[PDB]
Amino acid sequence: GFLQGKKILITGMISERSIAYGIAKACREQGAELAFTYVVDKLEERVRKMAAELDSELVFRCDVASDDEINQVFADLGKHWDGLDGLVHSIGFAPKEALSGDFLDSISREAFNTAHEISAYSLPALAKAARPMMRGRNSAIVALSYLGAVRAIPNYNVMGMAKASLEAGIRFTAACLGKEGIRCNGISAGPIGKLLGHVAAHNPLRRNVTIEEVGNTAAFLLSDLSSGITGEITYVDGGYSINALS
Amino acid sequence: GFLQGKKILITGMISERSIAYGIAKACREQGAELAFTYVVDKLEERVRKMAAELDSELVFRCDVASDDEINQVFADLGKHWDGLDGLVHSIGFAPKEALSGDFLDSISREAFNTAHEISAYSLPALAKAARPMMRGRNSAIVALSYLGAVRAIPNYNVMGMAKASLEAGIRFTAACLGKEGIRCNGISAGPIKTLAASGIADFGKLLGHVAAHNPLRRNVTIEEVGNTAAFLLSDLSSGITGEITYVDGGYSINALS
Amino acid sequence: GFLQGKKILITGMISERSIAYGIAKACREQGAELAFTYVVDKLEERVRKMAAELDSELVFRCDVASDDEINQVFADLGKHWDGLDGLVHSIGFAPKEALSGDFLDSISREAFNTAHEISAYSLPALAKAARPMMRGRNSAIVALSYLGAVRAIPNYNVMGMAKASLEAGIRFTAACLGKEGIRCNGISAGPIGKLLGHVAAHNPLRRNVTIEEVGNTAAFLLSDLSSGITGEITYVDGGYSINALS
Amino acid sequence: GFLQGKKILITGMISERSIAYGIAKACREQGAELAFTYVVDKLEERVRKMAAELDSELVFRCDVASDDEINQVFADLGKHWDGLDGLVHSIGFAPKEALSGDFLDSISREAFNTAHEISAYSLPALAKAARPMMRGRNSAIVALSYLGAVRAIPNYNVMGMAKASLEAGIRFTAACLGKEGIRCNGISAGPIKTLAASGIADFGKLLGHVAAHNPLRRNVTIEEVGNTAAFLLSDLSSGITGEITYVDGGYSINALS
Numbered sequence A, C: 001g002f003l004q005g006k007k008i009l010i011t012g013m014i015s016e017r018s019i020a021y022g023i024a025k026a027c028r029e030q031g032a033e034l035a036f037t038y039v040v041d042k043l044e045e046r047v048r049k050m051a052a053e054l055d056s057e058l059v060f061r062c063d064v065a066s067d068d069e070i071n072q073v074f075a076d077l078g079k080h081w082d083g084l085d086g087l088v089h090s091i092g093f094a095p096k097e098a099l100s101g102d103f104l105d106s107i108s109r110e111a112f113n114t115a116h117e118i119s120a121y122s123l124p125a126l127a128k129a130a131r132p133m134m135r136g137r138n139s140a141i142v143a144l145s146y147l148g149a150v151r152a153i154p155n156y157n158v159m160g161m162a163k164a165s166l167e168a169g170i171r172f173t174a175a176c177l178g179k180e181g182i183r184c185n186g187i188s189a190g191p192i193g194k195l196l197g198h199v200a201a202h203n204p205l206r207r208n209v210t211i212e213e214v215g216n217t218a219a220f221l222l223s224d225l226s227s228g229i230t231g232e233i234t235y236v237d238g239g240y241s242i243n244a245l246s
Numbered sequence B, D: 001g002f003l004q005g006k007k008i009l010i011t012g013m014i015s016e017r018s019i020a021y022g023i024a025k026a027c028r029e030q031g032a033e034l035a036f037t038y039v040v041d042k043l044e045e046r047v048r049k050m051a052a053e054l055d056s057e058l059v060f061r062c063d064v065a066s067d068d069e070i071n072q073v074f075a076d077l078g079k080h081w082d083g084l085d086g087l088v089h090s091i092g093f094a095p096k097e098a099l100s101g102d103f104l105d106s107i108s109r110e111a112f113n114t115a116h117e118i119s120a121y122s123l124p125a126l127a128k129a130a131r132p133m134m135r136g137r138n139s140a141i142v143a144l145s146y147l148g149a150v151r152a153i154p155n156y157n158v159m160g161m162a163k164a165s166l167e168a169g170i171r172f173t174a175a176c177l178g179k180e181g182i183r184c185n186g187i188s189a190g191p192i193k194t195l196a197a198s199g200i201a202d203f204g205k206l207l208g209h210v211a212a213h214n215p216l217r218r219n220v221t222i223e224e225v226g227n228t229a230a231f232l233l234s235d236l237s238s239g240i241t242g243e244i245t246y247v248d249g250g251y252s253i254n255a256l257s
């Protein structure tokens, strides 16, 4: 496995449908040792169960709204691990009412603030707090984005602005940390209900992508095989974004 | 002029170095009738004076931190104008300390929040509040962005994230309002010496570097940005929406120069 | 008119449906003085008629396959004009059989060569030959491209490669000539038969663009109003390219 | 390895400095079985020797100027392999004189034609000729591009146009073959000291500049490019097609550094 020896912290795994679960599974198959965060105490048992199945008992509460909690994750993780080789950002949130219907009607200041804070600021926040553990290790950060960053899409609305902020965050983080041996890259994943049918009917592959396909791309981006790649957004959408008038 | 009789609301004009002043002047030269906002009471006299020189006495206070103030602008403007043909977003802010040195060291939650709220959310916020006055008119919105949206750049730091959010905001606003006959476009301007620009550490170096490295071998002017905005606000650009146009003398498309 | 005093050479005007005609009309409405090329002697009378309606009697034969003919246009034009303020490239060609069906089946070496030579090399070829007349005048070049440069599109096939070469040509020409006061920009126009219905149903404006809308954008890019813009591809497609999953 | 038993044809390997050698080595480390092409008879011995070290004795002459030769490669390869899982395009050329100084002065019709034919048409030409052997296998194609596709760069000149054509070729090939289970992706590599690179005037300056200005503060290696290619040739990347991946240490996304 090309992640043998790599210690990787994975955020956002709340079920076996999660993109973060696909990533966790892919990484574990390549020999990585894993740790996980969970947003609220309600989910602890569920995440520990999933973690145990991936041979891990390193599970920490982390609401990225809280600087204290973010920093506490690494303080706790540092008691088990000498350093951190991989960091997976697979976290996004916006109020449901902002993700429906007319873009301007659905938007509000508070929804904008929440979306950006949780979905975009969380990348640099986590990179900043992880920096002591990651620097000098030839380590890597991977974050999940979506086509809404660069195209107007129905319903995605304010989340598109937040993903754009995120992708820029990826570039600035990469430029910031490259000299000290930390890479930062993004994956823009295809959708994973009629929207699914649209993508599958319109993309070069004529099908939707899987969490395994996203997961394997993340595993690659977290490994030394991708050591020449930083500040990149890789599209795992079966070529959807590069097709038009299909 | 190609904006003859078009009614245009311009934000962000605080001096004759302002990009918004360049835009205002360009629009007025093409026959537009103008109105202006100003962020705080301390600037009112200055902005009224500048407005008067551009043949306008429609001036309104607007801190885009405040939904009350944003919406009040259009309630007040509506007493004078039956509709609005143009809206110019030329507003940005981030705490100075976040715009200097190492990206992660300089960033904070609060600075991120402020930068995005003032510099990015303000676009849809203004479009939303202007929508009743603009819809059904073949009207247009223009906002100012910067290369930090799409490239990592020293010192610009968290503002780059905010500009990226803004540019996506431009696309989503365009997609949202196109059916109602309102267009929304961006201009990514090259560096220009303005009050806000002096907030960025080592700005004079960015300016010197661009002039030495762009195809035109010089920096752009507020007039050049202004004329591009005037075009994007006019019916001449009626086939263009959701676009970011680079007015940077070709800097962004050059490398290893 | 914002093109008063501007002398502009326009290629590719073969009918009043031509994008080049829209450009010519738009430019003339803003006060420009025009000249025209035509590819073959068969079209001379038609183009002279159109030119006369746009108040011009400066019409020259030019097959861009021929260096001699390209250079001869400027030798002849130079007897009437002191300099050249605007150059409009609105020329594209590929064999019809390469523009239908499966991309690889439809392609051939000869079709590729022809498409690129006529549709892409013609930009630098014309810029090169115009350079003595255009330099130091604060002049401008505009070329027409299409979404096939940057997206895979059905049927457009090898022309997509040629347009990509063209757009890169625009950037390299802009970088080359900027110091001597010549700008070079592109317009990526929307389509102008079911494809039309698709774009009109899917773009932000919910309609197709007109030759007038393309023409006015060209007029702007040829004027001093756009003096801060070079090496740019401006999309006049009603926002189609920036929309997805619509 | 993640390419265990995958059969991969590699073009463009003429020395151990070649990007194609880096790719070949990376693929072989992951269990792939390899075959190689060489442009002229004068290089045959060298390429056979290199191939033998990568456990291969499948070596074929192919000048991509010739449709006969391109198609003959697959006719000959088909005697040994029942199908093809991977195809690597690592070939480029333009006359030296077109790669030096002023873009327009240096360009000519003939140089343009040659550059595009050898460097861009060769991708679809090879994909087309490989199609019967590759279809229905979940196979993959990888081609090498450079930043000149999307930025104006000194000296690269007409090659930039050719690389742009190539990248569009990658997208069109991907859209064409996806239904048959063949993927097609590109790698835009940072500058690397190779035989072909020495064709570009002032290449050593491009190399020095990139290392001083990219996020990683160093140039990339053929191993880094090679491992990315191996990934793109494998089932691990089965969700990726029509993509240009930048292996340049983040150079293209940095500005004003």
Ligand SMILES: NC(=O)c1ccc[n+]([C@@H]2O[C@H](COP(=O)([O-])OP(=O)(O)OC[C@H]3O[C@@H](n4cnc5c(N)ncnc54)[C@H](O)[C@@H]3O)[C@@H](O)[C@H]2O)c1
Pocket: A011, A012, A013, A014, A015, A017, A018, A019, A020, A038, A039, A062, A063, A064, A065, A089, A090, A091, A092, A093, A118, A144, A145, A146, A147, A188, A189, A190, A191, A192
């Ligand atoms: N599924 C898709 O179609 C798709 C496509 C592209 C990108 N993405 C992105 O991938 C990422 C993962 O989403 P998913 O599709 O696996 O959905 P998911 O619900 O499985 O995962 C989203 C995760 O974000 C976490 N989260 C939300 N608020 C948080 C907070 N305050 N602190 C910490 N964690 C918080 C949730 O707990 C959840 O585990 C998201 O960033 C999403 O935008 C998803």
Ligand SMILES: NC(=O)c1ccc[n+]([C@@H]2O[C@H](COP(=O)([O-])OP(=O)(O)OC[C@H]3O[C@@H](n4cnc5c(N)ncnc54)[C@H](O)[C@@H]3O)[C@@H](O)[C@H]2O)c1
Pocket: B011, B012, B013, B014, B015, B017, B018, B019, B020, B038, B039, B062, B063, B064, B065, B089, B090, B091, B092, B093, B118, B144, B145, B146, B188, B189, B190, B191, B192, B193, B194, B195, B196, B197
């Ligand atoms: N000058 C440059 O180099 C440059 C380049 C590209 C883009 N821009 C952008 O152009 C726009 C205008 O900036 P400028 O360069 O003319 O500087 P400027 O200082 O003249 O204008 C900035 C304006 O933003 C306004 N503003 C700040 N906070 C506000 C708030 N809470 N409410 C309302 N208004 C507020 C200021 O009052 C000021 O009028 C900004 O979006 C900036 O990011 C500037």
Ligand SMILES: NC(=O)c1ccc[n+]([C@@H]2O[C@H](COP(=O)([O-])OP(=O)(O)OC[C@H]3O[C@@H](n4cnc5c(N)ncnc54)[C@H](O)[C@@H]3O)[C@@H](O)[C@H]2O)c1
Pocket: C011, C012, C013, C014, C015, C017, C018, C019, C020, C038, C039, C062, C063, C064, C065, C089, C090, C091, C092, C093, C118, C144, C145, C146, C147, C188, C189, C190, C191, C192
């Ligand atoms: N109509 C569209 O949908 C559309 C959209 C985007 C871009 N474009 C581009 O706009 C340009 C103009 O095309 P159009 O749509 O007006 O079609 P058109 O047929 O009106 O114009 C194409 C012109 O190219 C000229 N041409 C062809 N071969 C030539 C040669 N060897 N020498 C000189 N001239 C030659 C033709 O004579 C013709 O006048 C083309 O480059 C085209 O690709 C068209």
Ligand SMILES: NC(=O)c1ccc[n+]([C@@H]2O[C@H](COP(=O)([O-])OP(=O)(O)OC[C@H]3O[C@@H](n4cnc5c(N)ncnc54)[C@H](O)[C@@H]3O)[C@@H](O)[C@H]2O)c1
Pocket: D011, D012, D013, D014, D015, D017, D018, D019, D020, D038, D039, D062, D063, D064, D065, D089, D090, D091, D092, D093, D118, D144, D145, D146, D188, D189, D190, D191, D192, D193, D194, D195, D196, D197
């Ligand atoms: N070295 C770099 O800095 C760099 C960076 C990005 C991309 N690239 C690209 O990588 C690819 C490989 O180049 P490299 O850097 O390994 O140089 P190289 O000299 O090792 O390889 C170039 C190859 O192209 C082959 N070639 C040239 N003309 C040919 C023809 N008519 N038929 C068949 N093959 C032919 C040569 O024989 C040689 O094997 C090229 O596409 C190049 O443009 C190189």
